[PDB]
Symmetry: D4
Subunit: 158 residues, 8 copies
Amino acid sequence: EKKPDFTLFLQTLSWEIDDQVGIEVRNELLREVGRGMGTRIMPPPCQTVDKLQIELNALLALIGWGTVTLELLSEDQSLRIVHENLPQVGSAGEPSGTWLAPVLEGLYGRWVTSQAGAFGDYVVTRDVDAEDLNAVPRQTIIMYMRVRSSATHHHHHH
Amino acid sequence: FEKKPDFTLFLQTLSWEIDDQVGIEVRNELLREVGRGMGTRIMPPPCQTVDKLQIELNALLALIGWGTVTLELLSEDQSLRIVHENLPQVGSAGEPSGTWLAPVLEGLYGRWVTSQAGAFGDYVVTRDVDANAVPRQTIIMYMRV
Amino acid sequence: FEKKPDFTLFLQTLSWEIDDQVGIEVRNELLREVGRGMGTRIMPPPCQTVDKLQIELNALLALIGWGTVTLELLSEDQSLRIVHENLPQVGSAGEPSGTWLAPVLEGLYGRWVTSQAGAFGDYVVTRDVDANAVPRQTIIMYMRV
Amino acid sequence: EKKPDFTLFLQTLSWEIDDQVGIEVRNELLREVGRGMGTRIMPPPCQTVDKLQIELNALLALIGWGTVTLELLSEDQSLRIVHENLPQVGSAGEPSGTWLAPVLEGLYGRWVTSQAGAFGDYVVTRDVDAEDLNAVPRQTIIMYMRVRSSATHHHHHH
Amino acid sequence: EKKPDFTLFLQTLSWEIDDQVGIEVRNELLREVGRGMGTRIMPPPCQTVDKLQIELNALLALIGWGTVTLELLSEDQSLRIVHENLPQVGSAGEPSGTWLAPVLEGLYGRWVTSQAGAFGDYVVTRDVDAEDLNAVPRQTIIMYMRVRSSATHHHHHH
Amino acid sequence: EKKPDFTLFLQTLSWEIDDQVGIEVRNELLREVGRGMGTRIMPPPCQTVDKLQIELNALLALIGWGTVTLELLSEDQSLRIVHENLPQVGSAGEPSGTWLAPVLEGLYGRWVTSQAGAFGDYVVTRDVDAEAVPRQTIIMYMRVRSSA
Amino acid sequence: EKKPDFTLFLQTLSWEIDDQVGIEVRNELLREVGRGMGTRIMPPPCQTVDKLQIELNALLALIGWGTVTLELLSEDQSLRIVHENLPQVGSAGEPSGTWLAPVLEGLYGRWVTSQAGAFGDYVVTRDVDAEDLNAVPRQTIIMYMRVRSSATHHHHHH
Amino acid sequence: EKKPDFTLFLQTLSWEIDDQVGIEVRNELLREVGRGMGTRIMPPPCQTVDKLQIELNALLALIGWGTVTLELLSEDQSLRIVHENLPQVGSAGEPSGTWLAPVLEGLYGRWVTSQAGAFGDYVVTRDVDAEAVPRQTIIMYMRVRSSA
């Protein structure tokens, strides 16, 4: 036998979740999942972004969730994450096709913030601007990783 | 002659996550709805006998590698007995452990069988959980009224 | 991690046999009905846009390795244009040769698309056969009224 | 890619044919097919039933249509053909599961009557007696191969 | 399912044969097996070259020996066979990598001349010109099928 | 990603040879080829029979040619070789299905002779003392001879 | 997809290492890599042995290193690990075929002691008794996990 | 039917070694192992460079270790070896991803030295003259030396 196929199930599972639960809540559910995946498989402690890239691809390769490039952006030392071939699971998600994308946000977040302390206080953010979402495939997810903060006035409004 | 992404790990982590936040009964209900949804995506032809339905359902399971199933119509209660081998295991979540996916089958057999020819229509699905006789991934269900 | 029987040869010989005994138009009609039958066995969810339908149909094709498809809604006629790549080839039968299976797709897209949300319902399926621009196994169809 | 899957198609194709066309006509259609398959793949000329068996299995193996044993029955020199794992194609056919069985009748017929002249004037016959159809799997088809004949009174009634 | 590998066996077989036996005797040996393969798998009777081509590629596909095109050449009456991905079994043959090439000659011989009473009259010859074996990859094997003919004292030389 | 199938070629090749050359000459030829293969892939030098066994099985796994046990017999100083799943190529050979068997002689002959103290004075003989054994199981002995 | 094969590489690596370095140094080396593998793939925190077992087998499945059972032994407090199909890489190791066994010790070490504060205190030791390595296949590796302890002059011996 | 994956083991093994032993000692070790592998699988004795090439590629196909070209340079009498797709095992080695590269030296060293008249006076040197070449492409030269 092969292993069983979950594509059908996730197609229908994503439909149900989306029906019952807002875009928001579902995304937050999916990042926690991705964060948890990253407690199950992890890179070793890498010396350089490049080495981190090779190790992440090895991990992706292990479950066939595609390939990734990492680019350290000096101008603000954010890190650009370009993930290719996010597995497609039916037409849910925004854009349609990309339901699993938050899983990556949580995955990359756990993965990358495990590094030197160099990337300790970082947060992942999916690039959703339809502009540069256009010239790149449906199943390509672009994320940026940067350091977090918070206003005193945001602080209330718990 | 190429490859497909694996969802096993993701489902281990989804299940764990769901079980953590929402609890058992509520997970089951959802899973049932989803299996019931699957059933609107793939479905058998209108079958005339149980034998024939059995074959059509195994053909459906083979398509997605979800195991095998036997079907038994019972004299005493006019109840249909469903014995499903090899439910895909996704980690240690579920009752008993390894069986998180079980209610998907309830939803699924629920839908696949009622779309059927005759008084089949009006039955419902309970999963047996009383009667170490049967392997971890074997799920036993009844369709009965 | 095991194997499945091949039907290619059998279909080469079936096609040849059918084409021999019953002729072209009658073969097409049958094949259309069969594709239309397939459509009652696997089916997309209710889609709201064409983009979404496209993805759902490719997911269905992938399941059975029947190729890929693009879908295009046209201003001028409100016509939907279907371009299917890699129809399984089964030997040299069909018009043009290699394409015996083409009308299965007519039946199939016929059913998959009409079960759909909206005025989708009332369309019909012609296959284009006028306009060496497009590969042997690419089938072009219109859904138009 | 794999090759495409025809199981779905044949499930539905066998349904349609059975709907429109009697058991009889469909079987006769399927033997002609099997006979034609045997014009596409064939054994070499074998010296012994055993050698013929090995060569047929090699051919079966080539398209995964299962395995076969051949037994030469001295008492009447019929040949017993026991085919295992006829591919299953949905629930049509009698018994349900065995829609493709006549394909074998035509296949074996071409295959076996290609031999020495030893098996020249032979006809294939599927054993359908529910008795010894019982203790053997659904996808096991038993055929007997024997020499043909015909009454003068059968001869009219064209 | 998991099959045995013959590549190494053939690597050593070709080398041994080539050692004991001429280039010429080896080729003739290999054409005969080639024509024997044609007795075991066949196209149906095709109405046109194009259909013949589809039917031959299906056969090639069956045993994974690569692909082919056929072009009817009429300034001449010959048929140009271009075969891609002749399986490679080590360094034997001329050019090296190409030992199995005569098998093609025998196979295409049988395969083509079974066809429309037109072709039955043809001999296969392999193009070995330096010129246009150079435009094309080493496992590409080019054959022409032409119609045969002979001379009053080529015979008497025997 | 798909490699080419050689079975049908081998089926037809075996036939062609067996037609034209004989059996004893075929056998001799196939034994050289087995010898040849053993110059292409080899075990390390082995300390024990049990080690050699694992080593040889790794070599057979590598090309999918089956599995083998090795038994060292004391009474006479011989080595019983049992090979399961000789690849079958059609109905040629003695018995039918085992055309490739002599390749095994050449091969084990070479793989074992290579050996440090598995005497390169060891010769090879395929057997029909031990019969029922599956069609594709081949039995062989390696015992030392002194030169006729 | 088609992966590279390391079996031969490991066959030669084990042999070379064993040549240069003691049995003991090799095992210790291999436990460390074993425990490093445990830093790259992990179970989640399991509530019971049985669940731990399911989670460990899933991990094993991931890299195809075989299967395992865990039995809580309470006349004692030890945990009996029985691992099947330790990958074989040639004839090295004691018994031969078993070179990779210490990797298991390090891997199970990390894997089990991550678990319920209960286990964190445990050392893995491999059962190598003649007796019950004989009931079981050579790639079956039996380990016990017990809790650690030490002596006032085993220390002073350093 | 599934064999075991060694990648994760290799990723972790490379790391462990590189931690504890150095690079030059690692390299030396891996070169012996390549030497070792070349005693386990070998080409036939080759007449030409072009033949050797096909032969070596068949050996690499056998274990999925990539492909190689061989070029014989006249000006000095050297042989340029270009290996594509060195198996990658994690981010170890110089550059990252190429930990296994020295195995290639041992291996080509052995496979070529074996050769009739590919001089067993030929030594090996891996190169960083030729840079962009893909991460997993390894370039090597074999040129004769006389002993320092």
